[PDB]
Amino acid sequence: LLDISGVLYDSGGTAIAGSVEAVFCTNESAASRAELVGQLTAPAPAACQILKERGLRPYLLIHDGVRSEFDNPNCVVIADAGESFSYQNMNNAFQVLMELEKPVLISLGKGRYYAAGLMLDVGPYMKALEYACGIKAEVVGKPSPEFFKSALQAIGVEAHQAVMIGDDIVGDVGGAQRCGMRALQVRTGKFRPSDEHHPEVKADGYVDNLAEA
């Protein structure tokens, strides 16, 4: 299983050297799959399924590029929204949640940041609403075990015979290991030196890039 941002490419985007020739379980939510795949398993379709099953109608706190994936709100769906994380948009999501009988916040990933310099990801804004509303988000995407399992099922491979490759030490590496996989940390993308000596997560191996992997 291959992470995309920080492994194949960095958005902005630009291919990481050696990664095109070296060649997917992604939390990408700024762009639809079609748009991402054009630029080159994702959380939006898995979210769509969960919404349908529960009669949930989302207020979408998202980037315009992923809106296609969701083609009287009773929950909020928050993604890697970037510039769309205006105060107006955040406040509107907040005010929706604060009027619900049963407030539900669905988050597409919980990454802290990604490399582009370093950029704030969905996670910090997820935490803002959790604190503001006094609720816990449901995370669809990595490191949720159902996300990894769906990606494994798509290729017909069990966890003990699979390896995840990623730049996010907790989200990718820790997450995959928790599901019974092996996992490798790349030193491209969001990687910082401390991630190789992380107090909680010891990757099964550390590699400079996808090519070395």
Add this chain to the structure above:
Amino acid sequence: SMAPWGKRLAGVRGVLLDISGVLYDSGAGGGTAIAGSVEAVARLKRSRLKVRFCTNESAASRAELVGQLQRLGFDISEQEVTAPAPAACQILKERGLRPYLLIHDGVRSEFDQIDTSNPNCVVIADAGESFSYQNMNNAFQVLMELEKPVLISLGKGRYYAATSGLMLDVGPYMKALEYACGIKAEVVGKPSPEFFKSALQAIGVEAHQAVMIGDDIVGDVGGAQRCGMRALQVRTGKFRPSDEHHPEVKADGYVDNLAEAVDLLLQHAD
């Protein structure tokens, strides 16, 4: 039920007042007085009770805030207000800190005599519309390059009431950076004990003879009680009915508004 109000308010010589949600609710064109609160302040000033405003207000400078309130009819001077910006400025000076200011323009004047150039920390306040992704990201990028990252937050409130509904305050954006950077903010303002103590010292009243009146069950009420004061929760401002049955904080009393609090104080307090 509750102990008699006369027991509950016995010995109170001083009053710390929250502003937003207690005197007024902010909004476009200077906000709106809460009914009965202008006259309640007047009645307090006339009494022998000592009065201090203990506010986390950080969207506007004290001069601007005090101007807005005076224009609504309040009897209030800058000398009577304890607010976070000056306390933050003192701390920045004592530690050689130079802040990147994640703030509304209206409070920028408060930091006029601080060097923000070559910033070695971030100060986050109630920034409202200025919580753009760009500004949040810039603050984030400043913190991530620092050897020793320091985040100073002017309050940690979740939300406050405004004319346009409940609004996201400083706290949620504080929590965002804490998560993004992997650090804990230093909170200057309520409910930090030093903040309440500075306000008590300004009026020469000890905590066991003081009462805090506020709309924020954790920040105002829980905070004050943790410093040894009594505290009353108002039902105006950001108050929701679940706040009267809060699992952690049991206010010393609940009142509909400042007017009711003042009726009770002048009836039962010193």
